[PDB]
Amino acid sequence: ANCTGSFDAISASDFVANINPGWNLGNSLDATPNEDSWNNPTVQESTFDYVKAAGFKSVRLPVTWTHHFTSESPDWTVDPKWLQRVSDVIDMITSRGLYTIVNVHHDSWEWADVTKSDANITQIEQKFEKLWYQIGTKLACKSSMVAFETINEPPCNTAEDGAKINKFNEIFLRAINRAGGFNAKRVVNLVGGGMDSVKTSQWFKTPANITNPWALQFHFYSPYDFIFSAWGKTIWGSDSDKSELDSTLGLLRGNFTDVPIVLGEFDASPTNTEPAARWKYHDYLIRSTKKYNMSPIIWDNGLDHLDRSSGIWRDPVSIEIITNGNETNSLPDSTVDTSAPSQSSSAYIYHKVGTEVTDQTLPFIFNDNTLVSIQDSKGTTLKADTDYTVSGSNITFPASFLSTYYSETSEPGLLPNFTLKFSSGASPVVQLVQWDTPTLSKTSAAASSISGSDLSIPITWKGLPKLATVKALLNNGTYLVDDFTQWFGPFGEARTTYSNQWNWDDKNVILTQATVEAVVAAGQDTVFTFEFFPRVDTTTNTVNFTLTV
């Protein structure tokens, strides 16, 4: 390959500084078999106008190559139309002034999984080398704003696996260097096992005689329970929560003291996480990437953050937090005690149908900013000292003001919200919610009658149309799954896990087919308690469904 442009060489350190912060074009070129095969339509270039406008400096471009080969051994030819598609999307990004990182993505487990017992490691190496030679050839003449990343989250359980991941980095470096063009001075992102901080620290080794400018990329989706909505965890922000996060990043940095580091994916998704906890978490994560000189890139699958059809960011507070890391954020406080028998959140003003409208006081973590103004979502700035007062860290809304937004009898649902403008940092949003205890169309079912598939139960949402968690208890008191949640306090004991065991959609709460098969195996009627926000206690805002055996 021969290039006719110029190339502005950049060090890995300067590249990693320049890309902070990044955003992922998730579930697109990484979707299988085609870019519109999952939830997102065909990629359109205005999507990158929105990303640029929000303050991101870079776009990570996950690409899954598995379903775009037109031959197998020994050439492993990639469809030139797919290589052209990847090339053109990269051009969409860099022509708007955004840096790019492009990779090999779900290939990692679809065919390149070195941990499977039947894996032919020779063929994996061979196909991987051909793939990166062809990618590197097609992309050889891209500017220095385009970096290459070895492979996404490669499955890796043992040090023997970790040597094979090191070999991936070497095969990759050799392929792109033979491809030529500008690749010898192109910034690259090398990877460790599962892209996990500990596996990387344990087994990653710099490729001998490396000459590309290089950075290490890892992903961070901890703590599991909050990020994946496991075991009823719906809070984040205690001293130990922060210590676990700060430690995980610091032990990684402590093993790679002079290596530029890219945090290539993270996300407390607005779809499943509670906002006040989510904002404390994103705030603390950004603070920690700044402590340990890491550049973060948020994961967004198309439904998490940006709506690409409208340009609306579903969670504007998180985006502000991530794109303005030099600024201190004032945040709504929230319960962070797992032993607390009630959970509160200053990201919300909650009112129950059929109760009187009362004053509501929301504690905030001001972090030495001042409150400048508040504005509702209809465009009205509220009147300070009439519509709200400030006392210390507390923001109080009087009952007479709130009674202009809801009453004892108005319908349950989402009402206007309030955007709080502070001296500096992000502008948090307080969502008014009129809520009641949801009802279900059905209260029991035989498990035998409804197996082979998920169980969808129609529901009348009354307030937030989201599920917080599901408790599952056999008739004799044994937990349906995961006995160890008995140590997780009043809101965690006997609770089950999002997507694995339960879900929800617009009209239904859902028990998965695996959940149903667990009941049949237990041989015992099981009570499912669907639990909703607010989590004022363990029973009030909840409804039961019994699977019979």
Ligand SMILES: *[C@@H]1O[C@H](CO)[C@@H](O[C@@H]2O[C@H](CO)[C@@H](O[C@@H]3O[C@H](CO[C@H]4O[C@H](CO[C@H]5O[C@H](CO)[C@@H](O)[C@H](O)[C@@H]5O)[C@@H](O)[C@H](O[C@H]5O[C@H](CO)[C@@H](O)[C@H](O)[C@@H]5O)[C@@H]4O)[C@@H](O)[C@H](O[C@H]4O[C@H](CO[C@H]5O[C@H](CO)[C@@H](O)[C@H](O)[C@@H]5O)[C@@H](O)[C@H](O)[C@@H]4O[C@H]4O[C@H](CO)[C@@H](O)[C@H](O)[C@@H]4O[C@H]4O[C@H](CO)[C@@H](O)[C@H](O)[C@@H]4O)[C@@H]3O)[C@H](O)[C@H]2NC(C)=O)[C@H](O)[C@H]1NC(C)=O
């Ligand atoms: C969705 O479904 C779930 C599951 O079906 C529903 O949950 C269930 O709700 C019912 C109803 O609320 C609960 O019943 C209560 O149980 C109380 C004891 O609970 C504890 O023990 C049980 C049993 O444990 C054994 O069995 C299990 C097998 O499953 C074994 O594993 C275990 O080892 C034991 O062997 C436990 O199951 C229970 O666990 C739950 O809670 C713990 C604690 O957090 C959780 O960790 C668990 O995960 C689980 O969630 C717990 O360990 C029992 O005390 C209580 O009986 C009193 O109250 C009754 C109702 O009183 C109200 O109504 C009356 C009018 O009818 C009013 O007068 C009254 O004031 C009140 O308003 C009374 O009818 C009854 O007589 C008892 O009254 C006494 O106590 C009252 C409360 O103080 C007093 O007000 C009374 O005056 C009276 O006091 C007098 O008597 C006592 C005792 O004699 C004296 O001490 C006292 O001094 C005084 O003289 C009730 O039976 C059930 O526990 C719960 N089950 C589960 C699994 O959660 C859920 O509601 C539903 N949700 C929805 C939204 O629909």
Ligand SMILES: *[C@@H]1O[C@H](CO)[C@@H](O[C@@H]2O[C@H](CO)[C@@H](O[C@@H]3O[C@H](CO[C@H]4O[C@H](CO)[C@@H](O)[C@H](O[C@H]5O[C@H](CO)[C@@H](O)[C@H](O)[C@@H]5O)[C@@H]4O)[C@@H](O)[C@H](O[C@H]4O[C@H](CO)[C@@H](O)[C@H](O)[C@@H]4O[C@H]4O[C@H](CO)[C@@H](O)[C@H](O)[C@@H]4O[C@H]4O[C@H](CO)[C@@H](O)[C@H](O)[C@@H]4O)[C@@H]3O)[C@H](O)[C@H]2NC(C)=O)[C@H](O)[C@H]1NC(C)=O
């Ligand atoms: C505070 O309160 C605020 C006020 O209530 C609240 O704001 C609301 O926030 C929600 C969520 O962020 C917004 O909902 C989205 O609305 C999108 C459409 O918006 C346009 O049309 C609306 C109706 O007329 C207008 O209200 C809106 O006007 C506003 O915005 C303009 C742009 O700034 C502005 O110019 C206007 O003046 C005005 O300010 C706008 O014109 C809608 O597209 C979006 O739906 C997607 O996301 C849902 C999940 O949130 C999905 O369920 C849904 O299916 C859509 O996702 C699909 O499409 C995506 C894009 O392609 C894909 O990536 C997805 O995967 C998914 O794909 C499926 O469907 C495709 C077909 O569509 C198909 O191709 C795929 O195969 C797949 O099947 C969402 O509903 C709402 O607009 C906001 N309201 C207002 C008034 O602003 C705010 O959230 C509150 N703040 C906080 C912090 O709580």
Ligand SMILES: *[C@@H]1O[C@H](CO)[C@@H](O[C@@H]2O[C@H](CO)[C@@H](O[C@@H]3O[C@H](CO[C@H]4O[C@H](CO)[C@@H](O)[C@H](O[C@H]5O[C@H](CO)[C@@H](O)[C@H](O)[C@@H]5O)[C@@H]4O)[C@@H](O)[C@H](O[C@H]4O[C@H](CO)[C@@H](O)[C@H](O)[C@@H]4O)[C@@H]3O)[C@H](O)[C@H]2NC(C)=O)[C@H](O)[C@H]1NC(C)=O
């Ligand atoms: C670089 O990255 C690595 C990987 O993350 C970091 O190493 C890890 O550090 C943490 C914190 O110091 C360690 O956690 C502790 O683990 C001990 C048990 O350690 C023993 O068992 C391990 C399991 O196989 C083994 O890996 C260890 O081997 C190391 O240590 C020996 C002896 O020093 C040494 O000879 C080896 O060569 C290895 O270096 C070891 O044999 C456990 O007892 C601890 O519990 C205490 O602390 C926690 C902290 O909160 C507390 O909660 C408990 O109550 C208890 O008080 C603790 O969990 C982890 O084991 C280390 N992992 C490895 C593989 O070494 C390393 O710190 C990073 N370096 C820098 C500079 O940041």
Ligand SMILES: *[C@@H]1O[C@H](CO)[C@@H](O[C@@H]2O[C@H](CO)[C@@H](O)[C@H](O)[C@H]2NC(C)=O)[C@H](O)[C@H]1NC(C)=O
């Ligand atoms: C902020 O708001 C909380 C809640 O109203 C206040 O805490 C309460 O203080 C009174 C004492 O005046 C106690 O009786 C309550 O039990 C407290 N409630 C709690 C701790 O949840 C707090 O004082 C307020 N701070 C201000 C106004 O500066």
Ligand SMILES: *[C@@H]1O[C@H](CO)[C@@H](O)[C@H](O)[C@H]1NC(C)=O
């Ligand atoms: C593994 O694949 C290579 C290349 O496709 C092939 O030559 C080799 O014989 C295979 N080995 C086994 C054990 O199947």
Ligand SMILES: *[C@@H]1O[C@H](CO)[C@@H](O)[C@H](O)[C@H]1NC(C)=O
């Ligand atoms: C409850 O029933 C399950 C059903 O398999 C059984 O495994 C468990 O031992 C039982 N526990 C008690 C306390 O009865």
Ligand SMILES: *[C@H]1O[C@H](CO)[C@@H](O)[C@H](O)[C@@H]1O
């Ligand atoms: C969370 O904190 C609030 C404080 O406003 C309480 O009212 C609630 O019961 C929970 O403790």
